[PDB]
Amino acid sequence: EIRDLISEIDAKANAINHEMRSIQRQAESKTKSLTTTDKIGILNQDQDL
Amino acid sequence: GGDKDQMRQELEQLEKANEKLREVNNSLVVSAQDVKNEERDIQHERES
Numbered sequence: 830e831i832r833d834l835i836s837e838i839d840a841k842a843n844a845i846n847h848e849m850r851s852i853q854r855q856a857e858s859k860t861k862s863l864t865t866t867d868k869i870g871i872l873n874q875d876q877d878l
Numbered sequence: 879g880g881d882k883d884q885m886r887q888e889l890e891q892l893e894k895a896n897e898k899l900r901e902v903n904n905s906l907v908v909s910a911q912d913v914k915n916e917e918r919d920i921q922h923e924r925e926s
Contacts, residue, residue: 839900843907850908 865871872878 839904843904846904846908847911850911
């Protein structure tokens with residue numbers, strides 16, 4: 830049960846790692862309502878840029 | 879007696895190695911998921 834719990838909490842923490850990654854993304858998105866923090870990303874939109 | 883002593887020392891070093899392996903597996907999973915996402919995104923964009 831402990832090693833199963835180890836896998837369960839490792840998977841729970843892995844899901845939490847993906848969940849924390851999503852948190853970073855959504856937090857960045859909400860704070861990105863104002864002008865883009867870096868404009869090097871505007872040049873990634875098109876092959877010509 | 880010899881097995882008990884060697885197993886106890888090996889289990890201490892193995893718990894340390896298991897914690898290290900869990901950390902490195904988590905680091906490898908970050909990379910794995912990120913790569914798979916980048917792959918599917920590139921695929922869809924180029925196709926369209």
